[PDB]
Nucleic acid binder design. Structure first.
Lengths: 96, 98, 97, 81, 93, 97, 84
DNA sequence: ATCAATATCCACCTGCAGATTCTACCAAAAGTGTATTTGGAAACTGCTCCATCAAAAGGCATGTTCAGCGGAATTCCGCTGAACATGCCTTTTGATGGAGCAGTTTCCAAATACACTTTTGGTAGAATCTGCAGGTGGATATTGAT
DNA sequence: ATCAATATCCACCTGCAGATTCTACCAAAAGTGTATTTGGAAACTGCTCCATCAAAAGGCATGTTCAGCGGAATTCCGCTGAACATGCCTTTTGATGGAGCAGTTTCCAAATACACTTTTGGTAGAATCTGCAGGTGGATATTGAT
């Protein structure tokens, strides 16, 4: 009677990308299975190549490498653009 | 007294202790089931390397060279589905025709 | 000069090569091949001999797999040549990309 | 020196390299599509080759790393280093 | 680390028929399959004992690992001597 | 009476499956058959029902992959039906034992 | 109690196999696609029930879930989506 | 070229079950001072291995012809799958029990982490057969023309 | 039914590099031996979600029946194995040589394990309002023997 779920952040980001539509339960389960298995394979090869580089701590360069080597080139240039952009944003952690 | 022999059989256990530690995830691993990793590696490497004795009448050659072990790893249909997409360096193909 | 029928001589050359296990493509040809395909999309980098040897090993193994099952797809159609539609049907049955 | 030349004109090796498996009489025009399929396969293995090299942060290439990449594309040419 | 298996490969090939010899280059092939199916049984054992969220990895999950990837015949006589040797450790105190 | 060609069931049945993605195979006979093949290895197994849904659309997916490739392997060889050499070449190219 | 139940192995039949078969696309069938679609659903379904219910029993568990069979489908390399 | 006969497309009406804000609530938590301890960042450099680089030589690739033989257009002609009334069986759902699963609480036993001491399993090398690659060579199949 | 230059196999000798078996050797995990803590395993017990009964419609079956068509088959040219000849691009063997890298040390951003607490995120009800399935009505293109 206690379960971690993914659907909440999913429906808020669906409503913010596109404004005005609805969702469905089995389609909720197919895209949350999609998000956890894409995390699953980035995580497995992230640990694998942070193992074989003989380096000891997981790092952002390492996972930018990871996301480059797992997903094809169109979303490679996308995901690296907002990888650098997100680290620009959270790296900019000031008082204002 | 010695762990491979206090086990008894003929693979080392003390390195696969920390080679499982090298690879593990679950933050905890037992100190007594090194006793099965050596059994796994014993069985699978003997269950390939003893078949290399089938070189004899087809090679009359005393070492276990690189085409030749795959040249008899093929007809182990029970074997080839354990190195499935895996393929040799300079191994050859078991020949056949139409 | 007596040389008889062609075609079963194809079969003895068949058995001639697949008895042997020599690395069948030529060396400095693949050397210049892999440099002049690598240097362009990512910049000037250097190679090592065992790594490049292993990567044309990969190239040989993959393409020999694809042409043997291309041969099977060709002899599906009751026919003995090799033609392009066999090749692209082989590429498509093999998981397009 | 670094200038582009065409090694896509590799060699007609397939009229012995298709002579590795049971290729019967050949009848040709395969040269361009065997050229296309092997150029696709080499570019597939070489971009993740150089991908580990930039994760290697040194400007050579090597064999243990090439077999890392070679199994991570799935086409694991097993057993060289 | 510099650490191989090829000496234990050589002791195995001697506790076959000792008449043959380990060749110069197939021991790299032997090393590569022993560590890669070592690593992949380690991967599946990791997450299969992670799906019940039990902390260690131990006997039940390893025999289910070494049955649930390798195919039938060598799997079942493999797990036969698996149980054999793991009792044979405990054969003494 | 109105009548049109035996063999021209094709396009209307094409759309007639294609608009809908409901599960093709009828359910509880398929439950019976998966229960019967499972029942002769280990005792007292049950199914969870969505597990039956999972294995149902697994066999649906693997069968549509099978005869989609036998469809174009049949048209590979100027042929209009599928026959037994088509499915046997599919089970050559499957790669899974 | 003994649950002696024999063949449902032909049980999906010529209209059923032709409706799945044309659902895949093919529009001209030959008169013996009975037995091979029989044998191949035999092969694939015994593979999935073997791996799935064997490690279901690894879960100390004599009663199958759905998450075990979807972990088996991803174990086999044909990862189904969306049943958890 | 052509209307019925489907066939499909819209399309309005209506049910009807269900996603979806909404509350809430609550219980375990993400953000937080913080001391601290270490692995990532980064200078220094011996040094090897990796890119050029030429010359003799040498297989071998590339162009040549060429000639049968096999891809293919065409026939046809038996024949075996598709529609289709037309019965009918097994379903398709709806309503009753219970073994057996979460989830608990609790115990004990194995594995962590600490010092320990050595010995065995990593190299260097070396040497020595030595197997074996590669030759030769002597004998033995071989299939198109006749 | 017969011949024979090519191809292969079986046997001998050599040389060459290389396995391998040492012996050192060394050095650094590893077996022993403590104690601590906490997860693995078992008892139990409520509460689902499994299991089996029985009533009525749609897809299933099935013989009938009829034609695209499968396989064979004949022939007809074009295109490719094949053999030869030659340039040519290797091919290896040194040779240079030089410039990135593996190792090295250091040293400090910072990760982590503490306590610790206001929030959100999950769940679960609920209700509701509405979106879609289905019904059915009705225009509208396509078409097949005529």
């Amino acid at each position: 009677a206690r379960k971690e779920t993914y659907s909440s952040y999913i429906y808020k980001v669906l409503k913010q990308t596109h404004p005005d539509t609805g969702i469905s339960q089995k389609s909720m389960s197919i895209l949350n299975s999609f998000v956890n298995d894409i995390f699953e394979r980035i995580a497995t090869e992230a640990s694998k190549l942070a193992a074989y580089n003989k380096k000891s701590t997981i790092s952002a360069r390492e996972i930018q490498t990871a996301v480059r080597l797992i997903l094809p080139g169109e979303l490679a240039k996308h995901a690296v653009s907002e990888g650098t952009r997100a680290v620009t944003k959270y790296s900019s952690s000031t008082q204002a | 007294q010695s762990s491979s022999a206090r086990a008894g059989l003929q693979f080392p256990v003390g390195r696969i202790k920390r080679y499982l530690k090298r690879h593990a995830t679950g933050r905890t691993r037992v100190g007594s089931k090194a006793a099965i990793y050596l059994t796994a590696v014993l069985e699978y490497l003997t269950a390939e390397v003893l078949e290399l004795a089938g070189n004899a009448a087809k090679d009359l050659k005393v070492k276990r060279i690189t085409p030749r072990h795959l040249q008899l790893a093929i007809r182990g249909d029970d074997e080839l589905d354990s190195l499935i997409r895996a393929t040799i360096a300079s191994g050859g193909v078991l020949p056949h025709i139409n | 000069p007596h040389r008889y029928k062609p075609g079963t001589v194809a079969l003895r050359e068949i058995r001639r090569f697949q008895k042997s296990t020599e690395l069948l493509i030529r060396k400095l040809p693949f050397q210049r091949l892999v440099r002049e395909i690598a240097q362009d999309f990512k910049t000037d980098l250097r190679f090592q001999s065992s790594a490049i040897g292993a990567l044309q090993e990969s190239v040989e193994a993959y393409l020999v797999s694809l042409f043997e099952d291309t041969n099977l797809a060709a002899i599906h159609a009751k026919r003995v040549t090799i033609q392009k539609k066999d090749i692209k049907l082989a590429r498509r049955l093999r998981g397009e990309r | 020196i670094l200038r582009d030349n065409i090694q896509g004109i590799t060699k007609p090796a397939i009229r012995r390299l298709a002579r590795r498996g049971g290729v019967k009489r050949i009848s040709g025009l395969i040269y361009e599509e065997v050229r296309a399929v092997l150029k696709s396969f080499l570019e597939s293995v070489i971009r993740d080759s150089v991908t580990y090299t930039e994760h290697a942060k040194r400007k050579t290439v090597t064999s243990l790393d090439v077999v890392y990449a070679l199994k991570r594309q799935g086409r694991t040419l097993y057993g060289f280093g």
